[PDB]
């Protein structure tokens, strides 16, 4: 069970559009998928959730964030359009193991630096 | 590089003392260490931070939480005393890979359910 984040770290100007890649490899079907981000001040923020039939963004993502969950590719890509300075962080894609365990398996992270 | 969380998942009574064990396996000099916790609603909370000479906890930790950082044993144990129902969550220990990487390696997670 592991997550792959193939996107190189990126530095972009505010107002750009960015895509963070993620693919999951797990023996369990329909895992709960997530996107979290570590901000410079250490806060770990919930960004997006999704399973095979639905996705849900955090309150603050309305209209600028969306995920591309492609089943045949086992992909759970995050798209930010447009990105803002406050989006500077390291994004972690992850999935949980089935209950009662339901513990998280994290990807290695992808840093996005947004120049003001 | 690995993070080992040795405490068993546990359910305990409000008012009890809980010890969350964490040992890190890395060759990097003075890595940043962390304790994070995730609540049922998917929200993650920064709990404690520390390097080889200091430690700083979240604002809510003053008075009830503390970390035991044993350099010789690469140990970063979290102690909650006393625990309250609000502390129910799964705790994750992690350390930072040095620059330019600056990404986290997580432990498996330890569930602590506190019953009133």
CA pair distance B12, A26, nearest whole angstrom: 32
Of residues A1, A4, A22, A28, the one with CA closest to residue A75: A22
Q: Dump the DSSP string for A60-102.
A: GGTTTEEEEEEGGGTEEEEEESS--GGG-EEEEEEEEPPTTT-
CATH entry 2.40.50.140 includes domain B1-116: no
Long-range contact pairs involving B11-16 (C-beta distance under 8 Å, separation at least 24): B11/B113, B11/B114, B11/B115, B12/B83, B12/B112, B12/B113, B12/B114, B12/B115, B13/B114, B13/B115, B14/B82, B14/B83, B14/B84, B14/B85, B14/B114, B14/B115, B14/B116, B15/B82, B15/B83, B15/B84, B16/B82, B16/B83, B16/B114
Backbone φ/ψ region at A64: left (φ over 0), alpha (ψ -120 to 50), beta: alpha
Q: Between chains, do B44 and A36 touch, taking CB under 8 Å as contact? A: yes
Q: Does B7 touch chain A (CB under 8 A)?
A: no
Partners of B48 in beta bridges: B35, B57
Method: X-ray
Tell me the resolution in Å: 1.9
- Least Cα distance to A7 among A16, A23, A20 occurs for A20
Chain A: give the shortest CA distance to residue B41, in Å: 10
Among the listed residues B22, B40, B8, B4, the one whose alpha carbon sits nearest the alpha carbon of residue B79? B22
Nearest Cα neighbor of B23 from B105, B111, B115, B80 is: B105
Cβ neighbour number for residue B78 with a 10 Å cutoff: 24
In chain A the first and final C-alpha atoms are separated, in Å, by 37
Q: How far is CA A47 from CA A29, A39, A87, B4, B12, in A?
A: 22, 12, 11, 27, 31
C-alpha angle B84-B66-B75 in degrees, rounded to nearest 5 = 120
Q: Is A21 on the interface with B (CB under 8 A)?
A: no
Residues on chain A touching B92 (C-beta within 8 angstroms): 104
In angstroms, the separation between the Cα of residue A5 and the nearest Cα of chain B is 12
CA Rg value for chain B: 14
- Give the gap in angstroms from C-alpha A73 to the nearest C-alpha of chain B: 25
Contact B33, B23 (CB under 8 A): no
- A34 and chain B: CB distance < 8 Å anywhere? yes
d(CA B103, CA B114) in angstroms, rounded, equals 31
Contact B102/A at CB under 8 A: yes
Question: What are the tokens at A104?
Answer: 């998280």
> What is the Cα–Cα distance from A105 to A1, expressed in whole angstroms?
7
Nearest partner of A34 among A61, A9, A72, A16, judged by Cα: A61
Mapped onto helix, strand or coil, the DSSP state of residue B2 is strand
Of A18, A96, A52, give the one whose Cα is nearest residue B92: A96
CA angle, A100 then A102 then A106, to 5°: 160
Q: What is the CA radius of gyration of chain A?
A: 14
Angle at A106 between CA B22 and CA A8, to 5 degrees: 125
Structure tokens that stand for A46 in this block:
């919930």
Tokens matching residue B44: 């993650």
Contact call for residues B56 and B48 (beta carbons, < 8 A)? yes
């Amino acid at each position: 069970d592991k997550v792959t984040q193939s996107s190189p770290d990126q530095t972009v100007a505010s107002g750009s559009e960015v895509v963070l890649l993620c693919t999951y490899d797990t023996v369990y079907s329909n895992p709960d998928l997530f996107w979290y981000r570590i901000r410079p001040d250490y806060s770990f923020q919930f960004v997006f959730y999704g399973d095979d039939s639905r996705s849900e963004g955090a309150d603050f993502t309305q209209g600028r964030f969306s995920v591309k969950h492609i089943l045949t590719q086992k992909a759970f890509h995050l798209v930010i359009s447009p990105v803002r300075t406050e989006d500077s962080a390291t994004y972690y894609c992850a999935f949980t193991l089935p209950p009662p365990t339901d513990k998280l398996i994290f990807g290695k992270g992808t840093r996005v630096t947004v120049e003001p």
